[PDB]
Amino acid sequence: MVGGVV
Numbered sequence: 001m002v003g004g005v006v
């Protein structure tokens with residue numbers, strides 16, 4: 001899994 005960035 002690759003987490004999102006805000």
Ligand SMILES: OC(C(F)(F)F)C(F)(F)F
Pocket residue numbers: 003004005006
């Ligand atoms: O999981 C959240 C998302 F979806 F990427 F915005 C977080 F902001 F925490 F990264």
Ligand SMILES: OC(C(F)(F)F)C(F)(F)F
Pocket residue numbers: 006
């Ligand atoms: O409101 C956004 C959230 F939801 F926190 F990701 C922002 F990144 F802009 F802060």
